[PDB]
Symmetry: C3
Subunit: 137 residues, 3 copies
Amino acid sequence: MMKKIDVKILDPRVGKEFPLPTYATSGSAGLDLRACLNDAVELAPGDTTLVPTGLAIHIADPSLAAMMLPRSGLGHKHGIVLGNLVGLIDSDYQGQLMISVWNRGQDSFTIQPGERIAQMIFVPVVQAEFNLVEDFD
Amino acid sequence: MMKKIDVKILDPRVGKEFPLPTYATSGSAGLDLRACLNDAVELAPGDTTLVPTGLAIHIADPSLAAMMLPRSGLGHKHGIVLGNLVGLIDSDYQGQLMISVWNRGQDSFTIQPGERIAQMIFVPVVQAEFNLVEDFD
Amino acid sequence: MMKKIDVKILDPRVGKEFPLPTYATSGSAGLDLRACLNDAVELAPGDTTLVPTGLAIHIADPSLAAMMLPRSGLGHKHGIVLGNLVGLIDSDYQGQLMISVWNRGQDSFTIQPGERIAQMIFVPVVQAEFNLVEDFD
Ligand SMILES: O=c1ccn([C@H]2C[C@H](O)[C@@H](COP(=O)(O)OP(=O)(O)O)O2)c(=O)[nH]1
Ligand SMILES: O=c1ccn([C@H]2C[C@H](O)[C@@H](COP(=O)(O)OP(=O)(O)O)O2)c(=O)[nH]1
Ligand SMILES: O=c1ccn([C@H]2C[C@H](O)[C@@H](COP(=O)(O)OP(=O)(O)O)O2)c(=O)[nH]1
Ligand SMILES: [Mn+2]
Ligand SMILES: [Mn+2]
Ligand SMILES: [Mn+2]
């Protein structure tokens, strides 16, 4: 299923030196996000750093949300994951997309400008309205 | 997309002193869950505690599930996340909704009664039936 | 919602000594995955190990993905979760399903052959096409 989503480029290297996120194959669930940094960031074991993407999206449709996830290789092999575990992006959010990068392992790790450091999926979401009851059926 | 979902209030402060979960905007993907506690809980670095919500839901439709996630600020800034990382809520689950709160950071943290300590999204889910094959197409 | 999904058995114990994953109830969101191991694996606090399932799936429909998650009991009570936090499975992936198991707690843990060590959900996904804009609406 396909959806056009408005994107605003906030840093002029995004789409040039730091490519825009894209899906590898027609069958990929997620796209890789890149670190928009001026210089490398050394991330010590146990530490968290906030990494900019240099872009904003506007999903706009309240039936859709995005979820940011670690990359599998980085998480398994290097312990490079997300400080909020999963990043939930609201349909009405229009600020810069930010990545909370957390080193959950035992070795220091260099976050390089342009590196594919996390990934993101778009999933349908349902807004609940609670119906108070005394007992369930 | 909208869905009415049956809720049973298990603690009489829920909906009064401890407001029921609600979506901030029409475009919010998730709603914030509150700690239903008699007194604050001090959570040391590395530790896990089980936090009640004082409510039960019954999703009932097997095409829907909920996922509990950390809040982004708490996770990034304070290392306050979930001990099971993501909490998966089945459509036929009718028990109290519980939150496994884990301090993944280096500073002790006070969990206060009524605090918005996690969030929850409802997503469509598909039940797979496995079809055994010798080779894929 | 239901979907037949092609599965290839890679280890002849899968479907015999190590049962194939199944949903507990008609209302379960996820199914439990089992460790396909010759012998137990002792996993020390802080450590990560790669656990085979002995099977491959081919989702095939680009409108669907799977997400691997910790089990709630294992994560909350034992600190046995996933090294990549959430495992994202692409529709065009045809390799062995692997589980990155991470001990985030303080006690060593024995991973036994056949144990239900994680769970997996199938969710619809949307592929985004970015539409560059100067300003949002
Ligand atoms: O827990 C996991 C996560 C992923 N995979 C497989 C399926 C997926 O399609 C592929 C690639 O995953 P990724 O998140 O794109 O990882 P990366 O880009 O590091 O290779 O690895 C697994 O077997 N288990
Ligand atoms: O990894 C993340 C998570 C969130 N956000 C943005 C989008 C989201 O709509 C907003 C708020 O997220 P939240 O989970 O509601 O956080 P909290 O209530 O702490 O502000 O922050 C990001 O840029 N990156
Ligand atoms: O954060 C969570 C996760 C789960 N549950 C409830 C709802 C779910 O339907 C049930 C079982 O969850 P599970 O992941 O299947 O756990 P396990 O097999 O260890 O019991 O526990 C919660 O209240 N909170
Ligand atoms: Mn990848
Ligand atoms: Mn919020
Ligand atoms: Mn279970």
